[PDB]
Design a binder for this molecule. Sequence first.
Ligand SMILES: Nc1nc2c([nH]c(=O)n2[C@H]2C[C@H](O)[C@@H](COP(=O)(O)O)O2)c(=O)[nH]1
Ligand SMILES: Nc1nc2c([nH]c(=O)n2[C@H]2C[C@H](O)[C@@H](COP(=O)(O)O)O2)c(=O)[nH]1
Ligand SMILES: [Mn+2]
Ligand SMILES: [Mn+2]
Ligand SMILES: [Mn+2]
Ligand SMILES: [Mn+2]
Ligand SMILES: [Mn+2]
Ligand SMILES: [Mn+2]
Lengths: 156, 156
Amino acid sequence: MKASRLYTLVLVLQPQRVLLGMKKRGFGAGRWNGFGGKVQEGETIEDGARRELQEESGLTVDALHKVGQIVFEFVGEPELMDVHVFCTDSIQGTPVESDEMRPCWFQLDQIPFKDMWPDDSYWFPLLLQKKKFHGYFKFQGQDTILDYTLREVDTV
Amino acid sequence: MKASRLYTLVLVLQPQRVLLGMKKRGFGAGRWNGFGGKVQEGETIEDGARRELQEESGLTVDALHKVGQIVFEFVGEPELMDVHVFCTDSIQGTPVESDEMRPCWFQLDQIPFKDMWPDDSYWFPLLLQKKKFHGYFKFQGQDTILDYTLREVDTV
Ligand SMILES: Nc1nc2c([nH]c(=O)n2[C@H]2C[C@H](O)[C@@H](COP(=O)(O)O)O2)c(=O)[nH]1
Ligand SMILES: Nc1nc2c([nH]c(=O)n2[C@H]2C[C@H](O)[C@@H](COP(=O)(O)O)O2)c(=O)[nH]1
Ligand SMILES: [Mn+2]
Ligand SMILES: [Mn+2]
Ligand SMILES: [Mn+2]
Ligand SMILES: [Mn+2]
Ligand SMILES: [Mn+2]
Ligand SMILES: [Mn+2]
């Protein structure tokens, strides 16, 4: 029994492209990723995801849709990361570079898997198929998966 | 905010009655409650719910569904309890007293609220109406609620 900390992850997925951000600092720096961060006290998970999307990308959205949940365990870290994954296709401003992230659009035949977290290669295809998923990944460091589970679900 | 630990709570709800257990030893001793406990590593939440029901009541479950999620914060404790609440749909066997619980059936107009956790007075009416819910309760000790939120949701 480990304790878990709540995080969000937001993918702006349109019919032919996806918006990712190059992490400029901190956890997972140097990798393309969705936008997100810790959930704060008092806000719902979905509202935390909307807040992190605005802080990191400048984008505001009226609604998000939860598509997945991924639990991350790191060797030597007692706390799990419980990451709630959201999507939207509907935005209405322009992405802005922040201190944390440089946003960039990618065509859906040019997903930069080699420059993303290794677990993304497993669950991102499900997200692109509009399937919902639950995942778990145990990492040694930032590069090496020691154990993982991935399952499609009808409800997250 | 605080990290959380993962728990289940299972209610055997039939059209005419509900099964509760009197806690005999540890946390929440002296109060009627559903059956449940900590979710174990690598175990799905729903599998943890089925396991705890069998251990504490002797009943085996052929079908159950998630009806709610309640987060508990106890003043002075470092972490939250994240409690996933389930109702059974099909059971077999007879309830049996265990070292931790004494099971007893209650008519649905005789819910023993005064001998249950104080938060049950808020969310249990939603469970009885077959409404899905999200709750949060901040406790000072075991008797006093300082703050809470409770909402009906379409999906848990
Ligand atoms: N795609 C992907 N995102 C991750 C992984 N691990 C992980 O913390 N994240 C996300 C969750 C959060 O949005 C973010 C970490 O939060 P910060 O932005 O506060 O560092 O990184 C991962 O393995 N893959
Ligand atoms: N109805 C109700 N159940 C609770 C509350 N707090 C709380 O831990 N529980 C349940 C969750 C767990 O299933 C159980 C405690 O698990 P243990 O058997 O590990 O002590 O008690 C509460 O405030 N109300
Ligand atoms: Mn943040
Ligand atoms: Mn952030
Ligand atoms: Mn971030
Ligand atoms: Mn138990
Ligand atoms: Mn237990
Ligand atoms: Mn128990």
